[PDB]
Design a protein around this nucleic acid. Sequence first.
RNA 1: UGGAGAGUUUGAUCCUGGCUCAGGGUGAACGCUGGCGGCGUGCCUAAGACAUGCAAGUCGUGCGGGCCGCGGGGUUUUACUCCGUGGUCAGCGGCGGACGGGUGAGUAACGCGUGGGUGACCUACCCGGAAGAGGGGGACAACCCGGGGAAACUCGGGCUAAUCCCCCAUGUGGACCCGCCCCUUGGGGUGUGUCCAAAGGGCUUUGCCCGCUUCCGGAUGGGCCCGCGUCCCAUCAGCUAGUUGGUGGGGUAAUGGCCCACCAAGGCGACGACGGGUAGCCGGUCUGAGAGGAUGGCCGGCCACAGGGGCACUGAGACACGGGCCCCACUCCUACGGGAGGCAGCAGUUAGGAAUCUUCCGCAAUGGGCGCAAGCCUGACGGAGCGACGCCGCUUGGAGGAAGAAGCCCUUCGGGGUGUAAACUCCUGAACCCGGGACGAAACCCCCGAGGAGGGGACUGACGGUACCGGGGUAAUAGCGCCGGCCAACUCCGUGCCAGCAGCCGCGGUAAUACGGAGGGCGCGAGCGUUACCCGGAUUCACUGGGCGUAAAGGGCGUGUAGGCGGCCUGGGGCGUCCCAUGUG
RNA 2: AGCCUACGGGCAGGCGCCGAGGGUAGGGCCCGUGACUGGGGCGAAGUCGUAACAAGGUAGCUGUACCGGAAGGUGCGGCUGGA
Lengths: 99, 83, 208, 99
Amino acid sequence: PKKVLTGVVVSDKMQKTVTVLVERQFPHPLYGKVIKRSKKYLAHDPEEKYKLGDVVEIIESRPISKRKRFRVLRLVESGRMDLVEKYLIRRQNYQSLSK
Amino acid sequence: MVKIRLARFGSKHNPHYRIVVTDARRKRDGKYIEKIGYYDPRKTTPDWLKVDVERARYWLSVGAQPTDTARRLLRQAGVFRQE
Amino acid sequence: GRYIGPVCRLCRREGVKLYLKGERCYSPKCAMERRPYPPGQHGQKRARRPSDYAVRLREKQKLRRIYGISERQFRNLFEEASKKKGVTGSVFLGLLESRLDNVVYRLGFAVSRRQARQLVRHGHITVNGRRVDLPSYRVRPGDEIAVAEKSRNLELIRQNLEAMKGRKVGPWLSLDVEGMKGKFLRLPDREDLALPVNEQLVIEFYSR
Amino acid sequence: RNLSALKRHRQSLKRRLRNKAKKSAIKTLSKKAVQLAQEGKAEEALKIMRKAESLIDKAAKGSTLHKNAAARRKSRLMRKVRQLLEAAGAPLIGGGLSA
RNA sequence: UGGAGAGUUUGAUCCUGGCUCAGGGUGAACGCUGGCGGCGUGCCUAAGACAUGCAAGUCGUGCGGGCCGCGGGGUUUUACUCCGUGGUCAGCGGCGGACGGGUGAGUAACGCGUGGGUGACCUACCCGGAAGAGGGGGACAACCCGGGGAAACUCGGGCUAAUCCCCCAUGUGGACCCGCCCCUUGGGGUGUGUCCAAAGGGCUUUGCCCGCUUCCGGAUGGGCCCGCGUCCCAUCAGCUAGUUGGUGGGGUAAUGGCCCACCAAGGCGACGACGGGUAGCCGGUCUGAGAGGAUGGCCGGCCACAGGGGCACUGAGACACGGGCCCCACUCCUACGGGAGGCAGCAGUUAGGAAUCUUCCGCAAUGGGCGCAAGCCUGACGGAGCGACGCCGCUUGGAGGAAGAAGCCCUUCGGGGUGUAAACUCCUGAACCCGGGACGAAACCCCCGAGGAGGGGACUGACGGUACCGGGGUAAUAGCGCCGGCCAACUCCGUGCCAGCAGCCGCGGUAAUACGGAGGGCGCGAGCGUUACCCGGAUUCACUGGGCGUAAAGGGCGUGUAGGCGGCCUGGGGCGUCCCAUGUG
RNA sequence: AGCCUACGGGCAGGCGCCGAGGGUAGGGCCCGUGACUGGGGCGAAGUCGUAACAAGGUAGCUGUACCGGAAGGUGCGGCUGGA
Ligand SMILES: [Mg+2]
Ligand SMILES: [Mg+2]
Ligand SMILES: [Mg+2]
Ligand SMILES: [Mg+2]
Ligand SMILES: [Mg+2]
Ligand SMILES: [Mg+2]
Ligand SMILES: [Mg+2]
Ligand SMILES: [Mg+2]
Ligand SMILES: [Mg+2]
Ligand SMILES: [Mg+2]
Ligand SMILES: [Mg+2]
Ligand SMILES: [Mg+2]
Ligand SMILES: [Mg+2]
Ligand SMILES: [Mg+2]
Ligand SMILES: [Mg+2]
Ligand SMILES: [Mg+2]
Ligand SMILES: [Mg+2]
Ligand SMILES: [Mg+2]
Ligand SMILES: [Mg+2]
Ligand SMILES: [Mg+2]
Ligand SMILES: [Mg+2]
Ligand SMILES: [Mg+2]
Ligand SMILES: [Mg+2]
Ligand SMILES: [Mg+2]
Ligand SMILES: [Mg+2]
Ligand SMILES: [Mg+2]
Ligand SMILES: [Mg+2]
Ligand SMILES: [Mg+2]
Ligand SMILES: [Mg+2]
Ligand SMILES: [Mg+2]
Ligand SMILES: [Mg+2]
Ligand SMILES: [Mg+2]
Ligand SMILES: [Mg+2]
Ligand SMILES: [Mg+2]
Ligand SMILES: [Mg+2]
Ligand SMILES: [Mg+2]
Ligand SMILES: [Mg+2]
Ligand SMILES: [Mg+2]
Ligand SMILES: [Mg+2]
Ligand SMILES: [Mg+2]
Ligand SMILES: [Mg+2]
Ligand SMILES: [Mg+2]
Ligand SMILES: [Mg+2]
Ligand SMILES: [Mg+2]
Ligand SMILES: [Mg+2]
Ligand SMILES: [Mg+2]
Ligand SMILES: [Mg+2]
Ligand SMILES: [Mg+2]
Ligand SMILES: [Mg+2]
Ligand SMILES: [Mg+2]
Ligand SMILES: [Mg+2]
Ligand SMILES: [Mg+2]
Ligand SMILES: [Mg+2]
Ligand SMILES: [Mg+2]
Ligand SMILES: [Mg+2]
Ligand SMILES: [Mg+2]
Ligand SMILES: [Mg+2]
Ligand SMILES: [Mg+2]
Ligand SMILES: [Mg+2]
Ligand SMILES: [Mg+2]
Ligand SMILES: [Mg+2]
Ligand SMILES: [Mg+2]
Ligand SMILES: [Mg+2]
Ligand SMILES: [Mg+2]
Ligand SMILES: [Mg+2]
Ligand SMILES: [Mg+2]
Ligand SMILES: [Mg+2]
Ligand SMILES: [Mg+2]
Ligand SMILES: [Mg+2]
Ligand SMILES: [Mg+2]
Ligand SMILES: [Mg+2]
Ligand SMILES: [Mg+2]
Ligand SMILES: [Mg+2]
Ligand SMILES: [Mg+2]
Ligand SMILES: [Mg+2]
Ligand SMILES: [Mg+2]
Ligand SMILES: [Mg+2]
Ligand SMILES: [Mg+2]
Ligand SMILES: [Mg+2]
Ligand SMILES: [Mg+2]
Ligand SMILES: [Mg+2]
Ligand SMILES: [Mg+2]
Ligand SMILES: [Mg+2]
Ligand SMILES: [Mg+2]
Ligand SMILES: [Mg+2]
Ligand SMILES: [Mg+2]
Ligand SMILES: [Mg+2]
Ligand SMILES: [Mg+2]
Ligand SMILES: [Mg+2]
Ligand SMILES: [Mg+2]
Ligand SMILES: [Mg+2]
Ligand SMILES: [Mg+2]
Ligand SMILES: [Mg+2]
Ligand SMILES: [Mg+2]
Ligand SMILES: [Mg+2]
Ligand SMILES: [Mg+2]
Ligand SMILES: [Mg+2]
Ligand SMILES: [Mg+2]
Ligand SMILES: [Mg+2]
Ligand SMILES: [Mg+2]
Ligand SMILES: [Mg+2]
Ligand SMILES: [Mg+2]
Ligand SMILES: [Mg+2]
Ligand SMILES: [Mg+2]
Ligand SMILES: [Mg+2]
Ligand SMILES: [Mg+2]
Ligand SMILES: [Mg+2]
Ligand SMILES: [Mg+2]
Ligand SMILES: [Mg+2]
Ligand SMILES: [Mg+2]
Ligand SMILES: [Mg+2]
Ligand SMILES: [Mg+2]
Ligand SMILES: [Mg+2]
Ligand SMILES: [Mg+2]
Ligand SMILES: [Mg+2]
Ligand SMILES: [Mg+2]
Ligand SMILES: [Mg+2]
Ligand SMILES: [Mg+2]
Ligand SMILES: [Mg+2]
Ligand SMILES: [Mg+2]
Ligand SMILES: [Mg+2]
Ligand SMILES: [Mg+2]
Ligand SMILES: [Mg+2]
Ligand SMILES: [Mg+2]
Ligand SMILES: [Mg+2]
Ligand SMILES: [Mg+2]
Ligand SMILES: [Mg+2]
Ligand SMILES: [Mg+2]
Ligand SMILES: [Mg+2]
Ligand SMILES: [Mg+2]
Ligand SMILES: [Mg+2]
Ligand SMILES: [Mg+2]
Ligand SMILES: [Mg+2]
Ligand SMILES: [Mg+2]
Ligand SMILES: [Mg+2]
Ligand SMILES: [Mg+2]
Ligand SMILES: [Mg+2]
Ligand SMILES: [Mg+2]
Ligand SMILES: [Mg+2]
Ligand SMILES: [Mg+2]
Ligand SMILES: [Mg+2]
Ligand SMILES: [Mg+2]
Ligand SMILES: [Mg+2]
Ligand SMILES: [Mg+2]
Ligand SMILES: [Mg+2]
Ligand SMILES: [Mg+2]
Ligand SMILES: [Mg+2]
Ligand SMILES: [Mg+2]
Ligand SMILES: [Mg+2]
Ligand SMILES: [Mg+2]
Ligand SMILES: [Mg+2]
Ligand SMILES: [Mg+2]
Ligand SMILES: [Mg+2]
Ligand SMILES: [Mg+2]
Ligand SMILES: [Mg+2]
Ligand SMILES: [Mg+2]
Ligand SMILES: [Mg+2]
Ligand SMILES: [Mg+2]
Ligand SMILES: [Mg+2]
Ligand SMILES: [Mg+2]
Ligand SMILES: [Mg+2]
Ligand SMILES: [Mg+2]
Ligand SMILES: [Mg+2]
Ligand SMILES: [Mg+2]
Ligand SMILES: [Mg+2]
Ligand SMILES: [Mg+2]
Ligand SMILES: [Mg+2]
Ligand SMILES: [Mg+2]
Ligand SMILES: [Mg+2]
Ligand SMILES: [Mg+2]
Ligand SMILES: [Mg+2]
Ligand SMILES: [Mg+2]
Ligand SMILES: [Mg+2]
Ligand SMILES: [Mg+2]
Ligand SMILES: [Mg+2]
Ligand SMILES: [Mg+2]
Ligand SMILES: [Mg+2]
Ligand SMILES: [Mg+2]
Ligand SMILES: [Mg+2]
Ligand SMILES: [Mg+2]
Ligand SMILES: [Mg+2]
Ligand SMILES: [Mg+2]
Ligand SMILES: [Mg+2]
Ligand SMILES: [Mg+2]
Ligand SMILES: [Mg+2]
Ligand SMILES: [Mg+2]
Ligand SMILES: [Mg+2]
Ligand SMILES: [Mg+2]
Ligand SMILES: [Mg+2]
Ligand SMILES: [Mg+2]
Ligand SMILES: [Mg+2]
Ligand SMILES: [Mg+2]
Ligand SMILES: [Mg+2]
Ligand SMILES: [Mg+2]
Ligand SMILES: [Mg+2]
Ligand SMILES: [Mg+2]
Ligand SMILES: [Mg+2]
Ligand SMILES: [Mg+2]
Ligand SMILES: [Mg+2]
Ligand SMILES: [Mg+2]
Ligand SMILES: [Mg+2]
Ligand SMILES: [Mg+2]
Ligand SMILES: [Mg+2]
Ligand SMILES: [Mg+2]
Ligand SMILES: [Mg+2]
Ligand SMILES: [Mg+2]
Ligand SMILES: [Mg+2]
Ligand SMILES: [Mg+2]
Ligand SMILES: [Mg+2]
Ligand SMILES: [Mg+2]
Ligand SMILES: [Mg+2]
Ligand SMILES: [Mg+2]
Ligand SMILES: [Mg+2]
Ligand SMILES: [Mg+2]
Ligand SMILES: [Mg+2]
Ligand SMILES: [Mg+2]
Ligand SMILES: [Mg+2]
Ligand SMILES: [Mg+2]
Ligand SMILES: [Mg+2]
Ligand SMILES: [Mg+2]
Ligand SMILES: [Mg+2]
Ligand SMILES: [Mg+2]
Ligand SMILES: [Mg+2]
Ligand SMILES: [Mg+2]
Ligand SMILES: [Mg+2]
Ligand SMILES: [Mg+2]
Ligand SMILES: [Mg+2]
Ligand SMILES: [Mg+2]
Ligand SMILES: [Mg+2]
Ligand SMILES: [Mg+2]
Ligand SMILES: [Mg+2]
Ligand SMILES: [Mg+2]
Ligand SMILES: [Mg+2]
Ligand SMILES: [Mg+2]
Ligand SMILES: [Mg+2]
Ligand SMILES: [Mg+2]
Ligand SMILES: [Mg+2]
Ligand SMILES: [Mg+2]
Ligand SMILES: [Mg+2]
Ligand SMILES: [Mg+2]
Ligand SMILES: [Mg+2]
Ligand SMILES: [Mg+2]
Ligand SMILES: [Mg+2]
Ligand SMILES: [Mg+2]
Ligand SMILES: [Mg+2]
Ligand SMILES: [Mg+2]
Ligand SMILES: [Mg+2]
Ligand SMILES: [Mg+2]
Ligand SMILES: [Mg+2]
Ligand SMILES: [Mg+2]
Ligand SMILES: [Mg+2]
Ligand SMILES: [Mg+2]
Ligand SMILES: [Mg+2]
Ligand SMILES: [Mg+2]
Ligand SMILES: [Mg+2]
Ligand SMILES: [Zn+2]
C-alpha cells in the first residue's frame, strides 16, 4: 500500500522537483525471457536537496501537480552519473534517427 | 438504504428466491452485498428455507432493512426470538 | 421419433444378427439365414475392401441400431461418457443399459427393444411406484421397475412375463415374476454385457 | 405531458432566487469588510466580519452554501481581515478574531 | 485423460511449397420440408423518422382553498355560514423524479480490468450513541377583481395557511482566525474571541407515537489519485504555450495548471512520443491436445449517450432520456404577433436490410417510490402471444406375416432387387371427448400480550379450468442431402466439350456409377442442405513447435553506439526465482 | 433609472471574460472521378523473327553503358549455376 520504488534522478532543472527514472523487470508473457522496462516520474523535492545522479526512493503521494504524484522519500546512495549517462546517451542517439 | 430481500432465481414457474443484503437501488436480481439465506416458495424439498442468523443479526443491527416478506422469512427462521 | 420401418434390412447390412424382433429373429431368419447378404440390388456382389472409416462407422451404427436410438441422443451420451472418469468405452455401454426402455427389454417384459419403448410411452411401466413414459430415463441402481397397476392384467404383459419365468436374466438384474417387479441391482459391467461390437471402434470413430 | 414535474421546476426557480440572494449578500459584505480592513477602520471592519461569519453560517444551514465550504469562506474571509488590520492597527475590536 | 489427416506440381521419386476439403461454433439468413410439447431466445443494418396507447409518482397524520356528497347545526329565532366527515381538483409544502428501463453513438482514455491510496473527500433515506426545541415576525400561490391573447400562456390590483421564508434566545456540540500539546501531508486534544440550531402533526391527551435541530460513530453508495494489464499503421519520427515546474490566489465535498496573475525553462519520444485508422471494456463466450487464436449479442459489473451542439439551475446526489435555457436540423399548430414536440422505455408504424415478435394479461408473486396505515403507482416485473431461431423430451405404431403379392427396377431370361416391406391377424392408444383441478400465498392488517418477543384469527392467483390426476378413446405427418477420389453408398436409360456439374483434383467430344431421370443404396431426421463468419486442421508467423550452400531467406565488407549475453573463487544484500501463511480473486 | 427593503442589503437591468455555432482566408490528410496515357494479367485463331534449354548451333548469366522492329547485340568487369 502507498507504493514505493527506487530509481536514479535524471533531472533537477525544475523548481522544487526532480525526475526519477525507475527500471523494472519481468518475464515476457509468451517468451519468458526476463525483459527490462522503465519509466520517468516527476517527484516533489521541497528543497532540491536531492541532485543529479542520486539514487532514491519515491513514494506514492497526494497530487502535487499535473504530473507530480510522488514525493522523494530518502536518498539511497549519492553520485551515480554513470547511470544518468546511459539515459542521456540513450537520448542522444534519437537525434540520429529522424530525417 | 441497505436492504435484506429476495432476488428471484430458477426457471420460469420455478421460482427460487435468495435472501440477501443489497442497496435498495440495486436492480433486484443484481449485484448483492452478501447472501444470507435461500428460500424455496414451494417446499419442493425438505430444506425449503434456510438462514444464516449469525450475520442476519449483524445486518439488522448495523442498520439493515427487510422487506415485509423478508420479515416473514426471518421471523419464521426465528431471528427475533430472544428469550 | 425413432426408427420405424424395415428393420431386418439392418440385420442384413451390418452383416451380424440383430436381435430386435421377437419370435422371428429366432425362427429360421432374423431375416438372416435366408439372405445373409446386405439389401439393395447388389449386396450379393463381390464385396469391396472397406476403409478404416467404413469399419469405425459400421461398428458404431451397429451399436446404435441395436439400441434403436437417435443420433443426437447416442452422441450426447458418448461425450457424457468421456467426462466421467472410468473407461469411456465400457462406461458408454453402461449409460446405454441404464436406459429405461432398455431395462424393460432386459427384464423380459417385452419381446423387442422397440415394443419395450411402446410399453413405456403408453405408461404401462413404473419405477419405485411412479408411472414413467420416457424411454430416456436413466435407471439408477435399486429401482422397482414394475408393471403398471392397470397394466398387470393384459394379454401381452401376462404373456411375456409368463414366458419369462425360469429364464434367469441379467447378472445385474433381479426379475420378480411374482408381482411382475424387477430391480436395477447395479450398473452392468464389461463382460456382463455381450454385443457384436468392439466398443473401441466407436471411440476411434468419434475422434474424426 | 402535463406531468407536474414543473411543480419541481417552479420550485427550483423560487429556490435559485433565495440562493443567489443569500450568496450575493455574503460576497458583497465580505468585500465591504476587507476593504475596510486594508484601509484601517478596524472599529467596524471587524463589526462587518462578524456579520459575514453569521450570514455565512446562516445560509450554511439551508441548502445554499454548505459543507466545509462554509468554513472555506470563513477561513479565507477572517484570514484576510486579520492580515489587513495586521498592517499596523492591532485587533481593536474584541469581536471576531481571538487574540 | 489429451494430440488421426487427405487430394493436387512429376513419366516416376524424394523434398520444398501453396491451395482445397473432412470438425466444432452462430443473435444467423436462404432453399426444400414440416407433427407435439418444455425451457430459452429473437433489428447484428439507418444513435434514420415516428401516428396511437401505456411507461413516475405519492402524502389530507405538513397547510389554506375550489367543486360535490352525507351527518349536525349555530345566536332566545332566522340570512347563512360555522362544525364534522368522505370524495375530488389544482395550489403551497415534503420525499421520489440521479433508481428502475433502453442503446454502443462517442471514447485508445485511469475508459475498463486488477491490486492499492485518500493526513485531500462527500454520503438522502436506515442503525447506534450524546444533547435540544423559549419567544417574535414575514411572503407567495391557490381564491377575488380587472385587462391582453387564436392558442400556449400572461400583465396588473387585493387577502391568506403551514413541517415555506426570517429575526431574537438557549450552544450538547460544531465551524473559523490565533497559541500551546501530541501525532505527522489538512490526524487528535485544548484555551481565548467570533459564528450557527430546531416544526410541528396524530392519538386511546397529560401518556404514547410519526416527525424536527446540532454533533460524533456505523452501514451503504460515491469523487479523486497510483502501480501494472488493454488494437492496426514507422510509407506517422520527431512532439509541446497551460506547454513542464514554482509562489500566490480562484474554484470544489476534496487533490491538481482545473482556471488565473507573476516567475523559472522546461515536459515527452524507437521501452514508439506526435499523427492517422479502428473500437465501448470485463466476468465470460467459441475453438484448440495444450500454448495459442478469435470474440464481447442473452445474463451480471463498470462506462458513455438519449436527434446534433453547448450551458447552468434545483438538489445529499444531475448537467439530469419522459426537467430548464440557447443554437442547429426535422415534426406540427397559428388568426403569422406567436406556440408545441423528441421511442436508444413497452407495443406498434415507417425507411433501410438477407433478416429480428404481440399496439396482449396482471400488480397475485418479487423488487421499487411515496404513506402511520388503508392504499396508490410500477410496459421494473410475473405471465401469455408470434418465429424449428437454439437446447431437450416426443409422435407418425408394436408382435405375427410368403423361399417372397401386385407395381416398378435390373437380367447371363434361368432370375435377382425393393422385401417382413405391403395386405392380412392380433395388441397398445398421440389426437379428441368427460370428471376432478393446484403448488406458487403468508405477510401487510385484526384482537391476546405492551404497539416488543411469542400466540392466535382472517384476506389476496394474472398465469388458469392451465399443469397434473382419474375415466372413455381413433393406427395416427416425412422429409432433405449425397452415392468418381477425399468420403459411407451402383446399375439402367437419356444426353454427345451440347445441356450442364464442380469445395479442390477434375466429368461430358456414342458405349458417363461425376451431366438429367429412374431403380436401388448411404447419411441424417422435424429437419435436411446452402451462403456468410470465427477457431480448427495450418507444425503455414513455429514460446510450446519452422527455417535461410543449391527449394523463399545472411546484410557487399568493416568500424562502432544503444541494447542483448558473458569465465574461476570468497563473502554481504535478497531485486529476479522459489516455499509458506493470509487477504483478494 | 425601475422594484423590494426591517436602510444594512436584495432582485431586475447594464458592461466585460469565456463562449455554442457561423463567416472569411490559408494549409494537411484521405476518398471519388477525369480526356489521355503507362505498364500488368487473362482469352479460339493471329503477325514477325528464334533469344534461351544440347557448343541452342556466337557457352550462359549478370552489374553497367550505348544501340536495335522484337526477342536481343555489343563494350567493360564479374560469376560457373559452363568446358
Ligand atoms: Mg512476480
Ligand atoms: Mg502542474
Ligand atoms: Mg503546485
Ligand atoms: Mg545521421
Ligand atoms: Mg527513424
Ligand atoms: Mg534524411
Ligand atoms: Mg521527412
Ligand atoms: Mg453478488
Ligand atoms: Mg409479501
Ligand atoms: Mg445440432
Ligand atoms: Mg392410468
Ligand atoms: Mg478431438
Ligand atoms: Mg481433431
Ligand atoms: Mg415533458
Ligand atoms: Mg400534485
Ligand atoms: Mg415537489
Ligand atoms: Mg496424466
Ligand atoms: Mg478431449
Ligand atoms: Mg495443386
Ligand atoms: Mg493436377
Ligand atoms: Mg516443376
Ligand atoms: Mg502426371
Ligand atoms: Mg518437367
Ligand atoms: Mg525430370
Ligand atoms: Mg500438401
Ligand atoms: Mg490455406
Ligand atoms: Mg463449418
Ligand atoms: Mg448468428
Ligand atoms: Mg425456403
Ligand atoms: Mg435458458
Ligand atoms: Mg417461445
Ligand atoms: Mg442497433
Ligand atoms: Mg454486433
Ligand atoms: Mg431503426
Ligand atoms: Mg399502466
Ligand atoms: Mg411523477
Ligand atoms: Mg403514469
Ligand atoms: Mg355542498
Ligand atoms: Mg352537498
Ligand atoms: Mg345535509
Ligand atoms: Mg330558509
Ligand atoms: Mg346557507
Ligand atoms: Mg349565499
Ligand atoms: Mg369542512
Ligand atoms: Mg391535492
Ligand atoms: Mg409540491
Ligand atoms: Mg426535510
Ligand atoms: Mg438509468
Ligand atoms: Mg440503464
Ligand atoms: Mg429487459
Ligand atoms: Mg434486463
Ligand atoms: Mg430498445
Ligand atoms: Mg428491444
Ligand atoms: Mg458493440
Ligand atoms: Mg479509472
Ligand atoms: Mg491507465
Ligand atoms: Mg486502476
Ligand atoms: Mg480500482
Ligand atoms: Mg480493489
Ligand atoms: Mg478505493
Ligand atoms: Mg451517510
Ligand atoms: Mg464511506
Ligand atoms: Mg431521500
Ligand atoms: Mg441518530
Ligand atoms: Mg452531545
Ligand atoms: Mg417577500
Ligand atoms: Mg397572482
Ligand atoms: Mg378576494
Ligand atoms: Mg378568446
Ligand atoms: Mg398580486
Ligand atoms: Mg398572508
Ligand atoms: Mg402569518
Ligand atoms: Mg406563523
Ligand atoms: Mg497540552
Ligand atoms: Mg496530549
Ligand atoms: Mg493540527
Ligand atoms: Mg476533525
Ligand atoms: Mg485550534
Ligand atoms: Mg451573535
Ligand atoms: Mg443564534
Ligand atoms: Mg384535554
Ligand atoms: Mg404532558
Ligand atoms: Mg392515555
Ligand atoms: Mg404518522
Ligand atoms: Mg463515539
Ligand atoms: Mg471509529
Ligand atoms: Mg452519518
Ligand atoms: Mg452517491
Ligand atoms: Mg473509495
Ligand atoms: Mg461525491
Ligand atoms: Mg495485470
Ligand atoms: Mg497504459
Ligand atoms: Mg481480450
Ligand atoms: Mg506501425
Ligand atoms: Mg502511408
Ligand atoms: Mg509524415
Ligand atoms: Mg526524430
Ligand atoms: Mg513538423
Ligand atoms: Mg503562460
Ligand atoms: Mg493552490
Ligand atoms: Mg456538495
Ligand atoms: Mg486547495
Ligand atoms: Mg492544463
Ligand atoms: Mg497552484
Ligand atoms: Mg497563467
Ligand atoms: Mg487574462
Ligand atoms: Mg514569482
Ligand atoms: Mg528571475
Ligand atoms: Mg524575467
Ligand atoms: Mg525565465
Ligand atoms: Mg527545450
Ligand atoms: Mg526539449
Ligand atoms: Mg517507457
Ligand atoms: Mg506508434
Ligand atoms: Mg462491433
Ligand atoms: Mg462504442
Ligand atoms: Mg478473456
Ligand atoms: Mg464467441
Ligand atoms: Mg478444451
Ligand atoms: Mg482459449
Ligand atoms: Mg455479434
Ligand atoms: Mg439489443
Ligand atoms: Mg451528446
Ligand atoms: Mg444531446
Ligand atoms: Mg433530495
Ligand atoms: Mg449541478
Ligand atoms: Mg449525462
Ligand atoms: Mg431526469
Ligand atoms: Mg437536458
Ligand atoms: Mg421517451
Ligand atoms: Mg426538475
Ligand atoms: Mg430552429
Ligand atoms: Mg402539416
Ligand atoms: Mg397547416
Ligand atoms: Mg400553416
Ligand atoms: Mg392573419
Ligand atoms: Mg392575433
Ligand atoms: Mg414579438
Ligand atoms: Mg415559428
Ligand atoms: Mg417501441
Ligand atoms: Mg409513443
Ligand atoms: Mg421496443
Ligand atoms: Mg416491430
Ligand atoms: Mg420493415
Ligand atoms: Mg424493404
Ligand atoms: Mg418477447
Ligand atoms: Mg413484496
Ligand atoms: Mg410491493
Ligand atoms: Mg388501528
Ligand atoms: Mg385516495
Ligand atoms: Mg398512473
Ligand atoms: Mg399493464
Ligand atoms: Mg415480460
Ligand atoms: Mg430452416
Ligand atoms: Mg419457415
Ligand atoms: Mg430435436
Ligand atoms: Mg409359402
Ligand atoms: Mg425374392
Ligand atoms: Mg421375385
Ligand atoms: Mg414383387
Ligand atoms: Mg443380372
Ligand atoms: Mg422377365
Ligand atoms: Mg438363382
Ligand atoms: Mg421370371
Ligand atoms: Mg389393402
Ligand atoms: Mg396377443
Ligand atoms: Mg380388431
Ligand atoms: Mg386405457
Ligand atoms: Mg390432451
Ligand atoms: Mg375437463
Ligand atoms: Mg374446486
Ligand atoms: Mg409474507
Ligand atoms: Mg401471523
Ligand atoms: Mg403484498
Ligand atoms: Mg408497501
Ligand atoms: Mg390493546
Ligand atoms: Mg392493538
Ligand atoms: Mg407478534
Ligand atoms: Mg382461480
Ligand atoms: Mg382464473
Ligand atoms: Mg372442467
Ligand atoms: Mg380399438
Ligand atoms: Mg399407421
Ligand atoms: Mg398396423
Ligand atoms: Mg451429405
Ligand atoms: Mg462412390
Ligand atoms: Mg463424389
Ligand atoms: Mg464419396
Ligand atoms: Mg462432399
Ligand atoms: Mg441436349
Ligand atoms: Mg445414347
Ligand atoms: Mg450411355
Ligand atoms: Mg466417355
Ligand atoms: Mg449416374
Ligand atoms: Mg432413391
Ligand atoms: Mg446436425
Ligand atoms: Mg444448417
Ligand atoms: Mg469477422
Ligand atoms: Mg482458419
Ligand atoms: Mg495441413
Ligand atoms: Mg493447408
Ligand atoms: Mg504461411
Ligand atoms: Mg503443414
Ligand atoms: Mg511465437
Ligand atoms: Mg517449415
Ligand atoms: Mg535462392
Ligand atoms: Mg556474406
Ligand atoms: Mg544476398
Ligand atoms: Mg545483393
Ligand atoms: Mg548497401
Ligand atoms: Mg563512435
Ligand atoms: Mg556509432
Ligand atoms: Mg552493453
Ligand atoms: Mg553469470
Ligand atoms: Mg549482465
Ligand atoms: Mg576456491
Ligand atoms: Mg561462485
Ligand atoms: Mg573472500
Ligand atoms: Mg554472489
Ligand atoms: Mg527477492
Ligand atoms: Mg514455510
Ligand atoms: Mg502456494
Ligand atoms: Mg493466495
Ligand atoms: Mg481468502
Ligand atoms: Mg484463498
Ligand atoms: Mg469463488
Ligand atoms: Mg450608514
Ligand atoms: Mg468565466
Ligand atoms: Mg474570446
Ligand atoms: Mg466554428
Ligand atoms: Mg469558433
Ligand atoms: Mg470555423
Ligand atoms: Mg479563395
Ligand atoms: Mg476516409
Ligand atoms: Mg485524383
Ligand atoms: Mg501516363
Ligand atoms: Mg489502360
Ligand atoms: Mg487471369
Ligand atoms: Mg477474357
Ligand atoms: Mg545469347
Ligand atoms: Mg532450334
Ligand atoms: Mg542461331
Ligand atoms: Mg563470338
Ligand atoms: Mg549454356
Ligand atoms: Mg544485362
Ligand atoms: Mg536481376
Ligand atoms: Mg525497324
Ligand atoms: Mg517500339
Ligand atoms: Mg552491335
Ligand atoms: Mg563478359
Ligand atoms: Mg569478384
Ligand atoms: Mg575476383
Ligand atoms: Mg571462365
Ligand atoms: Mg549447362
Ligand atoms: Mg576444362
Ligand atoms: Zn430379424
